Amino acid sequence: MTEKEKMLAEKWYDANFDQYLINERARAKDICFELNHTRPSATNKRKELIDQLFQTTTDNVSISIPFDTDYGWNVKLGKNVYVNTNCYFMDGGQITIGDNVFIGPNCGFYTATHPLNFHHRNEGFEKAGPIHIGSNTWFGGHVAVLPGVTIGEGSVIGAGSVVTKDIPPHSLAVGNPCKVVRKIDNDLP
Amino acid sequence: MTEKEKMLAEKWYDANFDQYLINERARAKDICFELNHTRPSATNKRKELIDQLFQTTTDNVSISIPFDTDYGWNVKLGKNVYVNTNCYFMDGGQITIGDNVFIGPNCGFYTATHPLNFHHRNEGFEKAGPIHIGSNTWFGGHVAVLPGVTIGEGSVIGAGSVVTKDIPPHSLAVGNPCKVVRKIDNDLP
Amino acid sequence: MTEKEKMLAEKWYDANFDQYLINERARAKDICFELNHTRPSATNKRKELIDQLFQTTTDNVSISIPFDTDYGWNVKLGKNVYVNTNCYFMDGGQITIGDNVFIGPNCGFYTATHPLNFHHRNEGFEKAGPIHIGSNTWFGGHVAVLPGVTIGEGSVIGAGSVVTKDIPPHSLAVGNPCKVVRKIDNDLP
Ligand SMILES: CC(C)(COP(=O)(O)OP(=O)(O)OC[C@H]1O[C@@H](n2cnc3c(N)ncnc32)[C@H](O)[C@@H]1OP(=O)(O)O)[C@@H](O)C(=O)NCCC(=O)NCCS
Ligand SMILES: CC(C)(COP(=O)(O)OP(=O)(O)OC[C@H]1O[C@@H](n2cnc3c(N)ncnc32)[C@H](O)[C@@H]1OP(=O)(O)O)[C@@H](O)C(=O)NCCC(=O)NCCS
Ligand SMILES: CC(C)(COP(=O)(O)OP(=O)(O)OC[C@H]1O[C@@H](n2cnc3c(N)ncnc32)[C@H](O)[C@@H]1OP(=O)(O)O)[C@@H](O)C(=O)NCCC(=O)NCCS
Ligand SMILES: [Cl-]
Ligand SMILES: [Cl-]
Ligand SMILES: [Cl-]
Ligand SMILES: [Cl-]
Ligand SMILES: [Cl-]
Ligand SMILES: [Cl-]
Incomplete structure (x- = not known):
């Protein structure tokens, strides 16, 4: 297996020295840079850059600058x-990320884990834990979502939350x- | 009532489709973008942009970039x-915001709420809860202040706080x- | 003592009106601005700017933009x-900062304290508490480290932590x- 294949299979992988992954990160970083330095009202250029970054044709994906991602192609987006x-x-x-998702400012969706033992960590190895964000969700500002976490459809995460589970x-x-406080009634009004 | 009037009256309003509000946000974002790409030592240009953004003649309002706001004209500023x-x-x-207020890095003052029910939320409606920041206050870094919250004059908010009340x-x-720990003696030294 | 010497000796100092300190902050802010507007793949230019900012020849110090510091020469860096x-x-x-240190996104290392009494605070005085970050450490995203805090070598700080002690x-x-959960086994593998 290549290092990319390991990354995608939830295995330890050589995040810092694998040329392929280095190059893919550099690609995404340069696109994010361009996006972050494109006037917000330059709608078509921004859409072009977002679609290039995520390697998809987005449908009402609104990204307020600055934005960052590592690969871009590894973010799967719904509409709205x-x-x-x-972020x-x-x-x-x-x-x-599902459809109809409201993500507040200053949110971090973190899939990377490093080894606890510094000898292994220092070698640059990582293990990636996918994040699943349900459709019909809302995140307040200043939220961190940790590796491997799933947020169910229809849920609301309060500002400042650290979503560990x-x-x-x-x-x-x-x-x-982050802990559940109560249920939401999402029945049709 | 217009949607702006609803916004300012703490009623639900059409944040996503009202052309007036859309246009006002676009104005503020483009000014922020210019400010965020103006050299920090370009004093006069930065003051001009800040005053344009807030639609006021500021008196020692120091804004370290990057900065963001939605409307600009809806932030009422004291001096110093x-x-x-x-932020x-x-x-x-x-x-x-009162006079003599020290706001740390990476602070978010969030007035927006969305409906909890996703059907209503997906329609884009919001309800705004004003924030009042007393004079003579200090906020550490990484603070989030939530909708409708008032911080009394003379108070200090520790870094990382999530001010819900x-x-x-x-x-x-x-x-x-965020919870009170103790009182501060602010008597004249 | 000059105000710089007071700053470095953990004494109250005139942070807002001392011309030397004002000028040194301006130096660092203008370099940060240039760095933050330099293409991420412009490796040589970025290294030059980082080394000018920290006034040192860095050894594998990787800074993802945006970045901010107040003085730059007051950050002592190891390698890797x-x-x-x-951040x-x-x-x-x-x-x-020691060697082999992984610092996540949106981390703040805050050495500044202000007086609690607003009369003294409004005069602009500050007192600085050094931060020591051990070698062989890992910080998740969204961490704040407060004034005077030391993080021991070989330790890991979870995302979202507010390190007060x-x-x-x-x-x-x-x-x-932030509280210790358990010990880390860092034995040589
Ligand atoms: C999601 C949100 C609306 C929930 O607030 P709510 O519906 O009023 O919540 P509740 O009434 O159920 O909770 C009240 C209690 O929970 C606590 N609480 C509420 N939100 C909290 C939060 N984000 N973090 C921690 N505690 C919180 C309050 O301290 C309060 O405690 P009490 O028993 O002492 O009164 C709110 O947390 C939020 O995120 N608002 C910020 C909005 C924002 O980020 N802006 C928009 C960008 S997406
Ligand atoms: C506001 C501030 C100075 C208060 O600190 P302080 O006056 O020394 O606080 P206290 O000694 O009264 O409080 C001590 C206790 O409260 C806790 N505490 C203090 N600040 C805290 C914070 N920001 N979040 C959570 N808990 C905190 C400590 O863990 C400690 O617990 P203990 O009882 O086990 O000792 C500090 O919280 C702060 O914000 N410092 C960072 C400054 C900063 O952000 N830089 C400048 C930018 S504006
Ligand atoms: C450092 C880290 C790996 C620790 O997680 P871990 O090794 O699985 O640790 P544990 O097994 O001790 O944690 C399990 C418990 O601790 C709690 N916990 C874990 N991380 C926490 C955090 N950052 N904040 C608060 N509580 C946390 C969980 O809520 C859980 O509680 P439980 O008893 O109800 O199950 C993780 O917190 C982290 O920071 N991950 C995010 C990575 C990141 O930021 N990306 C990389 C950039 S540097
Ligand atoms: Cl938002
Ligand atoms: Cl591990
Ligand atoms: Cl500050
Ligand atoms: Cl509601
Ligand atoms: Cl990281
Ligand atoms: Cl004090």
Whole structure:
């Protein structure tokens, strides 16, 4: 297996010296740089850059600058995804985002883990834990979502939350660590 | 009522499709973008942009870039307001800031709420809760202030706090959620 | 003593009106601005700017933009220091960073304290508390480290932590406030 294949299979992989992955990160970083330095009202240029970054034809994916991601192609997006300023989709592990998702400012979706033991960590190895973000979700500002976490459809994550464990669907959850407070009634009004 | 009037009256409003509000946000974002790409030592240009953004003649309002706001004209500023890097004044609800206010880096003042029910939320409606920041306050870095919250004059908010409830005057408060720890003696030395 | 000498000796100092300190902050801010607007793949230019900012010849110090610091020369760096996006080394108090240190995105290392009493604070005085970051450490994203704090060698700080007190070596610590969870086995594999 290549290092990319290991990354995508939830195995330890050589994040810092694999030329392929280095080059893919450099690609994404230069696109993010361009995007971050494109006037917000330059709508068509921004859409072109976002589509290049994610290697897809987005449908109402609104990205407020600055934005960051590692690979771009490893973020799978639904339609109607609203991403406020200063978010980071750290996507060595796939980040899957459903439809109708409101992401507040200063949110980090972190898929990278390093070894605890410094001898192994210092060698640059990582293990990626995918994040799944359900459709019909809302994240307040200043939220961090940790590796391997799933947020169920219909749920709301309060500002400042550190989401260390999976959140069931149709739930309001807040805190560090983030805990469910109560259910949400999402029936048709 | 217009959607702007609803926004300012703490009613649900059409944040995503009202052309007036869309256009006002676009104005503020383009000014922020220019400010964020202006050399920090270009004093006069930065003052001009800040005054254009807030639609006021500021008196020692120091904004360290990057900075973000939604409307600009809905942030009411005293004198001697020091805003460190990467703050966001999300001002659909009025953000009122007193005199002599020290705001740390990476602070978010969030006035927006969305409906909890996804069917209503997906339609883009919001409800804004004003934030009032007393004079003579200090906020550490990485603070989030939530909708409708008031921070009393003379108070200090510890780094990393998530301010979910009003903070009395002359108080030190820390945490997620932010809680008063003790009183501050602000008597004249 | 000059105000710089007071700053470095953990005494109250005139942070806002001392011309030397003002000028040194301006130097660092203009370099950061240039760095933050340099294409990420412009390796040589970035290295030159980083080395000018820190006034040292760095050895595998990787800075992902945006980055911020106050003085730059008051950050003492080891080799193999990896700093992800949107960090701020607020370095009126010295920030000492060891070798083989992984710093996640949106981390703030804050050495500045202000007076609690607003009359003294409004005069602009500060007191700086150095931060020491041991070798062989890993910080998740969204971490704040407060003034005077030391993180021991071999330790890991979970994402979202607010590090208010010193962390012993070879420890895993998480939370707001950040608390040791358990020891890390760092034995040579
Ligand atoms: C999601 C949100 C609306 C939930 O707030 P709510 O619906 O009013 O929540 P509740 O009424 O159930 O919770 C009240 C209690 O939970 C606590 N709480 C609420 N939100 C909290 C949060 N984000 N973090 C920690 N505690 C929180 C309060 O301290 C309060 O405690 P109490 O028993 O002492 O009164 C809110 O947390 C939020 O994220 N608002 C910020 C909005 C924002 O980030 N802006 C928009 C960008 S997407
Ligand atoms: C506001 C601040 C100075 C208060 O600190 P302080 O006056 O020394 O606080 P106290 O001694 O009263 O509080 C001590 C206790 O509260 C806790 N505490 C203090 N600050 C805290 C914070 N920001 N978050 C959570 N807990 C905190 C400590 O863990 C400690 O626990 P202990 O009882 O086990 O000792 C500090 O929280 C702060 O924000 N420092 C960072 C400054 C900063 O962000 N830089 C400048 C940018 S504006
Ligand atoms: C450092 C880190 C790996 C520790 O996670 P871990 O090794 O699985 O640690 P543990 O097994 O001790 O954690 C399990 C428990 O701790 C809690 N916990 C874990 N990380 C936490 C955090 N950052 N904040 C608060 N609580 C946390 C969980 O809520 C869980 O509680 P439980 O008893 O109910 O199960 C992780 O916190 C982390 O920072 N991950 C994010 C990585 C990141 O930021 N990306 C890379 C950039 S540097
Ligand atoms: Cl938002
Ligand atoms: Cl491990
Ligand atoms: Cl500050
Ligand atoms: Cl609601
Ligand atoms: Cl990282
Ligand atoms: Cl004091």
